[model samples]
Structure formats: structure tokens, C-alpha cells
Target: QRAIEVRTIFHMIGDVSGKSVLDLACGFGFFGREIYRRGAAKVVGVDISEKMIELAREESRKYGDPLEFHVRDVANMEPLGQFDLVNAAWLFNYADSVENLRKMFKVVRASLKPDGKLVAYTVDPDFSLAKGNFAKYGVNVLNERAWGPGYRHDAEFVPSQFSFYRWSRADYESAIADAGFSHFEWQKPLLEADDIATHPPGFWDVFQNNCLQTGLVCKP
Candidate 1:
């Protein structure tokens, strides 16, 4: 699942060479370091957890990646200057309310260059609670309900669990527009040919059918 997520994001934001990138919710600096290795001119990561930032900084130092990691909340963070691209995996879903959602987007808008893009991986708005179980893929969605803004749900991934709010596609559209973005596109997850060939016929069925997550891209 993580391999598919990273590959889809790379596909959506192609050609990072010489581009400046901001990684929000960059736990352990995974995306930040990867983008820098892909030849990005600059990469900065921000997260709300000090422990996460500490681990990220240590990992970056060990690899000599030159990526910067800071402890900050996206919704209330000051602009760290414009960037060519902003990667926000699991960021917007943290918003507990529509107003908070808008605030998160506002931070993204302020941090992006005029032509920059925001690529995010978030819960699919159309995902139904009645969908098949996803435990086989190490993911479990709890507290299912009809679509509504700020509808909370618990998600379990392996050894940890976290809660995120649900926001409809229309809700996201409004927030993006309010944040001054001119385009919003929903992208589907992609699996490499090798992934299919290496796994059994039904190995990916549950994950593919349930649509637990979706990709999003916004541009100003």
C-alpha cells in the first residue's frame, strides 16, 4: 500500500529536478528525503510532533540529505516562503472542522509559488463504511457513516490508530477555491506492473475494491 501511494504521488508530481518542495505531515522525513534525492533544489518538512521531527532530522543527518525538518502545525504555521511543490500526505483529513480545513488550505496556498501544485493523499470521499474489510492490507476504518463535513472516524494501521475527519468532494472544492487555487483534480491510485506480477491474483483485490484512500492535486 505504501509503495503504491509513493509511486502515485511521484507520478502526479513529476520532474522534481531543481524544484523546491515543502512536505507537510512528513513523518520521519520520508518524502522530503526522497524528493531531495530526486534532485529537488530544496526540501523542507513540517510536522506537529517534535518526536517525529527529531527522528526525521536524525535520519536526514545520517544520510547527509540536507533536508530541513521543523515542528509546526500546518493550519497555523507561518509561511516558510514560496515553494515549487507542496506534498501533503494525510494532512487535510486531520482537520476536525470545515473552518480548520480551510485554514490548512490557506497555509498551502500561501506557501506555494503561483504555479506550484499541492499533491495530497487522503481518505476517499466516496468510500463507504460498508465496503469490504481492509485488515488484510493492514488498514481498518472504523465508525462508518454517511458523508458529512467534519464527520470523524477512527483508522487503525498495524500497531497504531489515528482519527481523521471526513469531508465531501464538494467541501474540498470549496476550500480549494477559497484558498485561491484554480484547479482541483482527484487521482486514482496506481500499481506498478511488477506489483501485479509479483503478487497472487487476489492479493490486491480488497485494497483496490474498497478505495480506502485517494490522491488529490490542486494548482493556483
Candidate 2:
């Protein structure tokens, strides 16, 4: 939503030029816009939210980004295409269980070329650093007021929003690998101390301890 243009992180996952990209659970084509900017030949954004897709297509004209959005549930893992790359940024929070994670991996597998790459992010369930900071989970946490990408509410960390499938890093990896992804690299978003000292309440973790564990995986 408010996270696009924040360094164009999702769009820059890999080379987009002349490559087809399938963005699962695309929200207003936020990440898709960046892919097009990077020169993607075609960007296919899929989401269960039809309203969001409609709005994204309408708004895309403003920026003239090349892309298309579809109304579909990614949990089904329908074969999208031999996409050169896939990027799922805010997908973890939507996964309700380990089975959902497996389904996501299946979708990624089906949508990619044999060696296609996937750069994605998930919440880190083990990031207990903020467990005691209920007082700091307010809105003014991003760059001094809870801005793009990282920000969370104390009470927001619950199974309904951040279920086991959302933050389980180990499981995420295994599931993706099981679905056929080969070697992968994982990481966490570690904000600098200077950024935290000046922010409002939440210094990191957006969407209920949304401390993302990002990575890249390739289909073998």
C-alpha cells in the first residue's frame, strides 16, 4: 500500500527487462510498478481482491507502467506462466497455516521458468526483540513516525494476522525447497539505531511484528 517507491525494493529483485513477472497477491500493483520501471516485458499481477485490481489498473495510467492485474486466489497455485521472476513482498501475513505456505510455494513453482528466481519476504516469528516494547508499537515508528515498510502495533501480533505460516522462517524455506526451489539466501530487515531513536513508537515490524525475512530462491 504505502510501501511502494520506498527504494523500489520489490521491483529491483532482479532483472525485469524483457522478462515476464507474475506478482501473486498484488495490492494496487505497488510492487508491479517497480518491476515495469526495471523494464519487465509484461507484469501480471494476481490478487483475490478484485476491487484493488480494478483500482490499480485505473491508477496505472497515471504512471504509464506496463502491467496487468487479475482477480484470482493465489492459494490455488494456478499455472501463471514461465515467468522469469516472481516477487511476493507482503504475502506471508496472508498465509494462515503451513499448508498455505506450501500452496504458495506450489504457485511459485508453477509460475516460474526452470531457473526462474523468486525474491520474497516473510515475517520473522523469532524476532523477540520487540516483545517487551508494547509501549513502542505506536504509529510514529517509521523514520520518526512509522513510515514505509517497517511499523507494527503491539496488540496486532496474533494468529489471525501473523499466523504460524506467516513468520515461520524455517518452515518457509523447507516448504519452498520442497516445492522445487534450489539454493536460497535469507535475511532480515535490521534498521539502524539512528532510525529507531528518532521514530515515534514502532521502529520495525510492519503488520504485526512485520519484521520481514527476505530472500531469493531459484527453481531447479
Candidate 3:
């Protein structure tokens, strides 16, 4: 599952050299580190938690170039100048509400330059509670939520609630259009031939039968 998502994201972000990149919901600069490694001229990573920013800052030292990390929620992120591209990974699942999702796209709009693009992957629009195997880990899946168009699944050893938002394909597309991004593309998660050959018997089947997530790239 992880391998497939990583491969797709890398493909979506090909040839980033000489570009400025912004990483939203950048937990510990996970994708930002790679964007930098691929030769982005400047990278700014933003997250809601200061602790995540601290860790990301520390991890960034391996590259001699300076990297910036900010503690800011994606839905209400302040203006942070412009960038050639914005990369957000696995963040939309927590968007919670349509209003919040709109705010997120608005922030992305303000943060982008004219030809700028936003690339992201998140929980599949078709995700369902029945598809998960949380019980094996003693984790509780709420299955429902008062604020949902989504669901919640609790993880072990975490004080925070891991909430996931769901919206029909139309709803997501409408929100993106409303945010002023005119061009767009979508990709379903898939495993390559080499991926299936190396992994165990059932590893690829899970994602192949039920794509765990989806990806999108949009331009302003």
C-alpha cells in the first residue's frame, strides 16, 4: 500500500528542479524532504503542530540548503507567499467538512504562483468502514460521526482522534472548481508489475481490488 502511493506521488511530481515548493500538512517534512532532494530550489513545509515543525527542521539538516517549516493548520493557513507547486499527502481525510475543504483550497490558491500546481493523494472517495481491519489491532473504528460525511478510527498509543472525511466525487470536484483552479487530473492508486512480483501473495491484491487512496494534480 505504502509503496504504491509513494510511487504514484513521485511520478506526479517529476522534474521539480528550479521550482519553489510548498508542502501542506507536511508531517515532519516527509514529502518535502524528497522534493528538496529532487532539486526544488526552495521548500517550505507547514503543519499544524509545532512538534512536527521541530522534528522536520531537525531532519532537514542533511541537505545543506536552508528549509523552512511552519506550525499552521491547513484550513486556515496564513499567506506564505507563492510557490511553483504545493504538495499535500494523505491530508484530505481529515478535512472534516466542506467548509474546511474550501478553506484548504483557498489557502492553496493564495500560496500558488500563476502556473503553480497542487499535487495530493488521500483516502479514496469510495472508502468504507467495512474495508478496514482495525479489530485485529484492538483499535476501535467509530463507523460514524456527528460531523461526518466521514468516519473515525482510533489508533493505539495516540491521544488524538484520527478523523477521516469522505465526499462523493462530485462534491470534491465542485470544491476544487470553486477554489479557482481551472485545470485538473486524477489517478487511482495502482501497483506496478515489479511491485506485485516482489511483494507477498496478497499484498498487491488488497490495493488492486480496493484502491486505498486517490491522487490529484491541479493548476491555477
The most accurate candidate by lDDT is 1
Better TM-score candidate (1, 2): 1
- Residue 180 shift from truth in candidate 3, angstroms: 0.6
**Clashes by residue pair, model 3:** none
Q: Candidate 1 local accuracy as lDDT?
A: 0.88
Give me the overall lDDT of model 2.
Answer: 0.63
> On a 0 to 100 scale, what is the lDDT of residue 92 in model 2?
56
Off by over 4 Å in 1: 145-148, 192-194
Kindly give the stretch of ten consecutive residues in candidate 3 with the minimal lDDT sum.
150-159
Look at candidate 2 and tell me the lDDT of residue 183.
Answer: 70
lDDT for each residue of candidate 3 in 1-220, tens digit (9 for 90 to 100): 1566788898888889989999998998878888888899999999998998988888887655577989999898778999998999977767878788878888888889998899999766665556763332233456644455544444332234565666667767887899999988887764677876876776655455545478988889
TM-score, per-candidate, Cα-based: 0.93, 0.72, 0.86
lDDT of each: 0.88, 0.63, 0.77
**Model 2 C-alpha lDDT per residue in residues 95-189, reported as the tens digit of each score:** 66677768878788888888778766554545443443322333221111221222332233322222223345567678778988777766444
User: Which candidate number has the best TM-score?
Assistant: 1
lDDT of 2 at 102: 80
lDDT by residue for model 1 (45-155), tens? 999999999999999878998998889999999679999999998898898788889999999999999989999999887776687766777678767654355467788
For every candidate structure, what is the RMSD over all alpha carbons to the true structure, in angstroms? 1.7, 7.3, 3.1
